[PDB]
């Protein structure tokens, strides 16, 4: 028996969790075993680990007719609302009230967090993931490649263009080839974010391809006529080889390849995990130094950082109607908002990854001295996964390098950070339009975007046809509906 037990009798449940097209839930996970010993609830994962796309597996599991006990994952928020309304997911509201003190207290202390996850009816069908922090992404560049190539770090777009040109043409790594790739990243969508250098928005929030509020009017960054101006130039950057050719396909292994093979000169990504590499591969790559840099002056004469860390996110887990045990499950979810739950969901397993020091969890030397980023280890261990847990920023502060913190403070002090997009509250009638159309819309946008970047089609020639296709796809219906939801809230 334990004090953290949500049930006296051992509870084994079937959970289908497929997220980020990489990991599936594992009951043999150290974090999961810890969670089982603490909560007296065992989560058995029914999923295909050999599967690739997560959203596809979600749709398949849903349309299979046979529902598991708990459904977790990422970007399932809208789907959580759809099937929550359709009756596939049980409303947790009163369960949260009576049986989940920590969750209720959190939503009480965070009304703006609770508001976003609410259905048109107001019910909460899922316990979400709430990342803690301020900054999200910032630009990074090689220190040594600026020196031996004899040039000062770029203050603007032109200087950056000349720097990347000097990376591709002149040989910065001294191997004697042109093989080095100026721009890389482990997020393909970042290839669009480059349009910020020309003053174009790639999104409205942390989530890629998201609407934003411009002077009280809801608008999509991609549908705007200032988007293809930047898309042209980044397509030129690909054409010049300034951008990674595999940048769409390479994905997660990017930073561990280009930087490890010393082929990369520039990236975006995030502060901590990127700055971890400096210490990590320092023994392999002799002269490697990666430094944080300001968001260089755009064509608009401004300093733009489009990505900030959003409160909560479209992530989490929900309870199906076939669960038969709503109480133990909602209490199990309540456990992850508790201090020990946060401890095991962030810092991993005590006695292995971290120890308890004066009330605060501190990672072991084994974890901190590892070349591989801590979060990448916790992923494999079952921690920092997009479950209903509350993130603890201290865990990130521990392995954050002083230069990374300096870059963070630089971005905060510089106020390059843009305000995030909170979203709107839609009624049940106007929600269906978004739910049905927006998926196909953003799929189309991403496919055409990838077609533009790689230079398969032409930006200018296919621009009008693209606009008309967006018109017939029903995008502007969702847009005007979003304006219908927005204008009722913010007036003055």
């Amino acid at each position: 028996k334990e004090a953290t037990w949500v049930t006296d009798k051992p509870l084994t449940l079937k959970i289908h969790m497929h997220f980020r097209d990489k990991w599936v839930w594992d009951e043999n996970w150290p974090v999961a075993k810890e969670s089982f010993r603490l909560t007296n609830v065992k989560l058995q994962s029914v999923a295909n680990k050999a599967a690739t796309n997560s959203q596809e597996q979600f749709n398949l599991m849903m349309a299979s007719g046979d529902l598991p006990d708990v459904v977790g994952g990422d970007n399932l928020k809208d789907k959580f609302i759809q099937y929550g309304q359709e009756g596939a997911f049980v409303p947790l509201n009163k369960l949260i009230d009576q049986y989940a003190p920590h969750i209720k207290a959190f939503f009480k202390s965070h009304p703006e967090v609770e508001r976003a996850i609410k259905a048109p009816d107001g019910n909460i069908y899922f316990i979400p993931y709430v990342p803690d922090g301020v900054v999200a992404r910032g630009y990074f560049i090689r220190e040594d490649w600026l020196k031996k190539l004899n040039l000062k770090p770029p203050q603007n777009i032109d200087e950056l263009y000349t720097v990347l040109k000097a990376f591709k043409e002149k040989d910065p790594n001294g191997n004697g080839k042109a093989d080095e790739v100026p721009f890389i990243d482990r997020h393909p969508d970042e290839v669009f974010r480059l349009v910020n250098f020309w003053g174009a928005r790639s999104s409205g929030s942390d989530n890629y391809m998201d609407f934003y509020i411009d002077n009280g009017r809801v608008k999509h960054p991609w549908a705007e006529t200032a988007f293809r101006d930047g898309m042209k130039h980044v397509a030129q950057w690909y054409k010049e080889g300034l951008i990674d050719k595999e940048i769409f396909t390479r994905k997660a292994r990017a930073r561990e390849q280009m930087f490890g093979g010393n082929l990369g000169g520039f990236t975006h990504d995030w502060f901590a995990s990127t700055m971890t590499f400096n210490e990590g591969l320092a023994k392999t790559v002799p002269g490697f130094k990666l430094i944080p840099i300001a968001p260089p002056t755009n064509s608009k004469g401004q300093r733009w950082e489009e990505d900030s860390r959003q409160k909560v996110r479209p992530d989490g887990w929900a309870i199906t109607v076939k669960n038969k045990n709503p109480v133990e499950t909602i209490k199990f979810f309540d456990f992850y908002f508790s201090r020990p739950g946060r401890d095991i969901s962030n810092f991993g397993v005590p006695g292995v990854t971290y120890d308890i020091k004066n009330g605060k969890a501190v990672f072991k030397d084994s974890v901190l001295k590892s070349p591989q980023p801590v979060n990448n280890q916790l992923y494999d261990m079952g921690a920092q996964i997009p479950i209903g847990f509350w993130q603890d920023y201290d865990y990130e502060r521990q392995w954050t390098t002083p230069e990374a913190q300096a870059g963070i403070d630089m971005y905060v002090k510089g106020k390059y950070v843009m305000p995030g997009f909170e979203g709107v509250n839609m009624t049940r009638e106007e929600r269906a339009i978004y739910d049905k159309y927006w998926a196909d819309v953003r799929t189309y946008m991403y496919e055409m975007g990838q077609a533009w970047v790689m230079g398969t089609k032409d930006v200018d020639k296919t621009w009008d046809e693209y606009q008309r296709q967006l018109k017939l796809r029903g995008l502007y219906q969702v847009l005007q509906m979003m304006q219908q939801a927005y204008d009722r809230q913010y007036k003055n």
């Binding site: 596809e56 749709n59 398949l60 349309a63 093989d179 050719k245 595999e246 769409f248 396909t249 991403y446 496919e447 990838q450 077609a451 790689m454 398969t456």
Partner: protein
């Protein structure tokens, strides 16, 4: 009558025939019963119009026809050609080695073949682009380029299936009695004169049956390859009716329109194989 009379002795034979027939009634004709269903929801006779009016499906059937023509023109004759070339080879050891090497890739899995395609053609990494760099000509990302999709596919195809399909033809030209060749030798017929004047018209019915078998589907050609290696940028030229039916039906979980397209595809395949069989019946020796 004689029904019960012969059945009494034929009993065990029908007991052998029973599980197979039942198997076919279950796993084959029952989904045909399901084919007559799903044609209505969600009655009926409607979503076909959605199929014909959609820009996606029309390019799907477009590239289905295109891939059919390409695979038929380039892919089908190659096994025959291989068989003819191997047939002309003396020094039984060398011919044996050739047979081993050429028949080998058939046993390679389709996912492994596709993996070989993506590995060989990977930019800055794959051997192909490296050999292109050694001669010093450009470089190419192949799988992201639609233009290269079809030439790659069939190539891989004629790498994998050429020899194994050449086995049948080789066995067909080895079934010819030597006298036909030797008498022509007495008359002083050329090698090419022999392969053209006798060997080929002797192997004609075999290649005809194998042709109406090839034309038996031809809409489903390279489905498992396409569903594997088709990139979002190459989605345009790579898409085939079978791939459409899969993506909407199995993935997108839309059973109605997918079943409709399935019925359409099966019907057209039946028509084209009926025509093919007829023309390979009247004109060509034997047939179905």
């Amino acid at each position: 009558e004689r029904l019960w009379k012969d059945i009494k002795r034929d009993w065990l034979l029908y007991a052998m025939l029973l599980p197979t027939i039942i198997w076919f009634l279950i796993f084959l004709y029952k989904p045909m019963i399901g084919l007559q269903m799903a044609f209505k929801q969600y009655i009926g006779f409607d979503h076909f119009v959605t199929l014909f009016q959609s820009e996606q499906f029309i390019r799907a059937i477009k590239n289905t026809l295109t891939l059919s023509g390409l695979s038929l023109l380039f892919g089908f004759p190659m096994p025959i050609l291989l068989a003819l070339m191997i047939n002309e080879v003396y020094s039984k050891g060398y011919r044996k080695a050739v047979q081993t090497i050429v028949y080998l890739p058939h046993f390679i899995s389709i996912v492994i073949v596709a993996g070989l395609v993506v590995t060989f053609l990977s930019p800055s990494t794959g051997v192909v682009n490296n050999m292109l760099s050694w001669i010093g000509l450009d470089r190419v990302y192949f799988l992201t380029q639609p233009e290269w999709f079809r030439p790659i596919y069939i190539s891989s195809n004629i790498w994998k299936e050429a020899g194994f399909d050449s086995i049948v033809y080789l066995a067909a030209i080895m079934s010819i009695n030597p006298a036909l060749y030797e008498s022509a030798q007495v008359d002083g017929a050329t090698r090419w004169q022999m392969i053209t004047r006798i060997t080929l018209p002797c192997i004609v019915p075999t290649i005809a049956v194998l042709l109406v078998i090839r034309l038996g589907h031809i809409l489903e050609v390279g489905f498992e390859y396409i569903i594997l290696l088709y990139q979002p940028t190459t989605y345009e030229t790579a898409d085939v009716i079978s791939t459409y039916i899969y993506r909407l039906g199995l993935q997108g979980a839309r059973y109605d329109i997918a079943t409709a397209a399935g019925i359409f595809n099966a019907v057209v395949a039946l028509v084209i194989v009926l025509f093919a069989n007829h023309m390979s019946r009247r004109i060509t020796k034997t047939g179905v």
